[PDB]
Symmetry: D2
């Protein structure tokens, strides 16, 4: 609800289905603690990662397992994973969507932050 | 229904609202004939452009009026408009979403073609 | 020097070589006049399209023939071409680099504009 | 020569100058070891990070300090940094260019990989 991930495939023109996504929260000692994870749906989306109560301000990392995705399609890719690192800020709008558009040697990512 | 346009703003991290979009179909003589138009909604989307009956195979152009968008925000942009030119093909999946992610001096565009 | 085009392939992780590029300029009657054309090199770059004398103020369209590129590679892409339309030189001469990063169903484009 | 980083600004239409870049390499114990670092030049380019001797096979992370860039411009961006993680040189030495195109709430990144 407060956090959604959307993943698209630029080679096939389709949602990127069954992609593993792992979310981490930065701890006090600067290590990354597991926070949430799942796999994208048939629409390329992963909902239900967290709740408003748990998603407090801090630094988060969303790791999208792109290498496995491309390998399953028989395509050799560049990156190990796509990484998106950001601060959640209570001032700003309350719903974060992290989107990524994937190619074998490239990716784009954007944030849609709305109320 | 068969054609949707989605426009996002990479400067503000938000849907690009009230952006004019014009769709053209290539005519026999190679001119561009007006086909559909509208303005993006509060979610950055423009639905209802065409129907399955009218959206036959052919070459289409989607022109997104980015310059006016940026000017209304007080930002000086590079492009006159973003252009997306493609062939609609009956073989492939039946629903086309044309997405564009806008910055003042850059844009990205992708197609999500699904059934 | 005043206008350069750079094209990259996001599938291969390489320059996009032998990509045809056509530039047009909008005339006073609002039609698109052919202005220049060429092909990217083995570096993905196309230089020598125009001269500072010829490249006057106007609205220019840079058409990058992406479908022909992907088809010559045996691949069926979505777009016909990538089109970049911009006003040039309206505060005096500038140098423009138009870059594009290509995938079969997507592309990104940017401009680097510098003042000599 | 073996590793180059190029950064562009999608807001300004310019190179992204004075962008800090940190490269790490994954150690055998699975931690990220500092490998090299530098700043982009007035061309948006960072050269001289490593040597072909030093740049052995491994998993490398290129951290581009985008937040610091946008903040030094007085702008409040979304991301902390742009991170590019890849296996390098696992079929022998290659030359890698890592490119990034930056906006306040978005970035794109690509790689050009060539065989000397
Ligand atoms: S919307 O939720 O209906 C919707 C439909 C289709 C596509 C999108 C979407 N979300 N993000 C993107 C996108 C992200 C990036 Cl990083 C880039 O470069 C592009 Cl071109 C699109 O598309 C939303
Ligand atoms: S080259 O040095 O002459 C050159 C000039 C201008 C721009 C480039 C360049 N390199 N990469 C890119 C680029 C990267 C990405 Cl990730 C995206 O999305 C785009 Cl549109 C361009 O541009 C090289």
């Amino acid at each position: 609800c407060p956090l959604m991930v959307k993943v698209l495939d630029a080679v096939r023109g389709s949602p990127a289905i069954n992609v593993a996504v792992h979310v981490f929260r930065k701890a006090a000692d600067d290590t990354w603690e597991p926070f949430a994870s799942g796999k994208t749906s048939e629409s390329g989306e992963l909902h239900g990662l967290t709740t408003e109560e748990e998603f407090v301000e801090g630094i988060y990392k969303v790791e999208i397992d792109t290498k496995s995705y491309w390998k399953a399609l028989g395509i050799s890719p560049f990156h190990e994973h796509a990484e998106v690192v950001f601060t959640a800020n209570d001032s700003g709008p309350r719903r974060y969507t992290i989107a990524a558009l994937l190619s074998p040697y490239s990716y784009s990512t954007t944030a849609v932050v709305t109320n």
